[PDB]
């Protein structure tokens, strides 16, 4: 059923799985009208579909045209997400389709389950983990491609860059969730940490900086300090 800290290691076994996060599918900018009412304007969004083992991210860009003339957008967003994940599974070769898809929000279960009726042998699971995938739009290259898109588009990334050459997927996922949690709790400080030292660059084909192993330790320590900090700043401790 639900994925939590007891079966956390299942994420890195050899059964193909995908996380699906829908937080950034429907995104708006609430503003005042001339009559002094309030109105939203939509902006491009994305579905965050991630293989936690390999790091393959299928970033489906949601172009604002997909909302035109539509009612109840927040509900539509869930079905839109489900349709696009389903279209994605169907595009994949059989030996590449997931055996499980884990949704990060329980409201996605039914939409996805319905769109996946053709795939009875693929389990749709929730999770109790409070994963920080909403902060994916705090990654500059991802945010950039989303905002520039002029039509629906799928863009493939590895969110681990080359890290699996040196570390395990368990450790790569941990680093990733720590980076994202930091970006979610204090984007400014987090970005300062990552980019403070001009000599550490982001390769054209990567999302994060080229940190030596020792530098990743320093960085990881700085992100944990920031998360404890903001937790204190928040709760006063």
């Amino acid at each position: 059923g639900a994925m939590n800290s007891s079966n956390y290691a299942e994420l890195f076994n050899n059964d193909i799985k995908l996380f699906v996060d829908d937080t950034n599918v429907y995104r708006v900018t609430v503003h005042k009208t001339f009559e002094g009412n309030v109105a939203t304007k939509a902006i491009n969004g994305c579905i965050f579909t991630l293989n936690p083992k390999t790091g393959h991210l299928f970033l489906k860009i949601i172009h604002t045209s997909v909302w035109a003339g539509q009612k109840r957008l927040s509900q539509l967003a869930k079905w839109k997400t489900a349709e696009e994940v389903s279209a994605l599974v169907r595009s994949l070769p059989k030996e590449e389709q997931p055996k499980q898809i884990i949704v990060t929000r329980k409201a996605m279960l039914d939409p996805l389950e319905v769109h996946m009726l053709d795939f009875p042998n693929i389990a749709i699971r929730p999770t109790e983990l409070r994963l920080p995938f909403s902060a994916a739009m705090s990654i500059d290259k991802l945010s950039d491609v989303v905002m520039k898109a002029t039509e629906p588009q799928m863009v493939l990334f590895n969110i681990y860059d080359d890290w699996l050459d040196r570390i395990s997927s368990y450790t790569a996922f941990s680093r990733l969730t720590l980076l994202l949690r930091a970006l979610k709790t204090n984007e400014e400080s987090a970005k300062m940490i990552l980019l403070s030292d001009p000599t550490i660059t982001i390769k054209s084909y990567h999302l994060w900086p080229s940190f030596t192993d020792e530098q990743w330790i320093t960085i990881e320590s700085q992100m944990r300090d920031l998360i404890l900090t903001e937790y204190g700043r928040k709760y006063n401790v």
Binding site: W79, A82, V114, L117, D118
Partner: protein, 300 residues
């Protein structure tokens, strides 16, 4: 006026006849039920004094033969049987009617409760849900599982209700996933009514038979079928106006007749709150909602 005579009453039993019941003592001189209204299906049912486990009973229509009850001491229940010799049957029934060994089906003249609870139920459809073709009457008990339940184990002893599943390909047209899941009109009107049931009368009949198996036998899978058929209508934006009016009347008498003390197990909180307050037809069941609120406000 027809009669289900009884050979004897060797074991103490609460006997139910449609919505009535009466206690018979062990070896009491009891020989059946007379004055049973012609024109409806009926159900005679049993709950043994010693072992209240297994309520069980028979669905029958007196126009379809002469039926009686004899206790079988090997299988340990009151069995319905069909006496074929109609002259022996008049003689047997007349003997017991003369000795006043029978109770009278106690219909009050103003009382349309059974007609309203069985309006669309027909024996021929009962017999296709309960498959036992060498008998004209149909046996049901507390424990019999439904075809759908056995999917999720003896096929011969199943209730073959129409399978309804809101997350199935039958229910969800390819390319209409959101539309059909949030508005089941397609499933109701095309798949179920036009496709499977043929008309709303067959659909209401099955729904009413499910409720009665739930109330009289505590058959859990029937209660599932009853609620599922209610939810499918309530969850349909587009329902013929006559079907809606009738549903309101159908449900009203089901809720009216339900024992107050069994509401905790026979009513599904989620289905009722959704049907009365959230669904498309939230405004289309005035009588059902008035009675539910006055009688079972706790559930809501």
């Amino acid at each position: 006026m027809n009669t289900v005579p009884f050979t004897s009453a060797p074991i103490e039993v609460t006997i139910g006849i449609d919505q009535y019941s009466f206690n018979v003592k062990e070896n009491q001189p009891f020989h059946g039920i007379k004055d049973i209204p012609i024109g409806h299906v009926h159900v005679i049912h049993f709950q043994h004094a010693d072992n209240s486990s297994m309520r069980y009973g028979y669905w029958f229509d007196c126009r379809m033969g002469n039926f009686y009850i004899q206790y079988d001491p090997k299988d340990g229940l009151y069995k319905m049987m069909e006496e074929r010799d109609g002259a022996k049957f008049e003689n047997i029934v007349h003997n017991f009617k003369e000795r006043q060994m029978m109770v009278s089906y106690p219909k009050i003249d103003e009382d349309d409760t059974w007609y309203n609870l069985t309006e669309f139920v027909q024996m021929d459809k009962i017999r296709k849900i309960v498959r036992k073709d060498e008998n004209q009457f149909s046996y049901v008990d507390s424990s019999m599982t439904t075809v759908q339940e056995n999917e999720l184990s003896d096929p011969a002893h199943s209730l073959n209700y129409t399978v309804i599943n809101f997350k199935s390909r039958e229910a969800i047209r390819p390319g209409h996933e959101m539309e059909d899941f949030l508005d089941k009109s397609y499933y109701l009107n095309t798949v179920m009514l036009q496709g499977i049931f043929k008309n709303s009368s067959n659909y209401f009949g099955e729904l009413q038979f499910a409720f009665l198996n739930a109330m009289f036998f505590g058959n859990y899978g029937s209660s599932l079928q009853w609620h599922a058929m209610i939810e499918l209508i309530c969850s349909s934006a587009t329902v013929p106006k006559h079907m809606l009016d009738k549903l309101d009347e159908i449900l009203y008498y089901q809720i009216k007749t339900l024992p107050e003390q069994y509401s905790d197990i026979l009513l599904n909180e989620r289905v009722w709150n959704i049907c009365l307050y959230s669904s498309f037809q939230k405004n289309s069941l005035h009588n059902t909602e008035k009675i539910m609120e006055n009688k079972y406000p706790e559930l809501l």
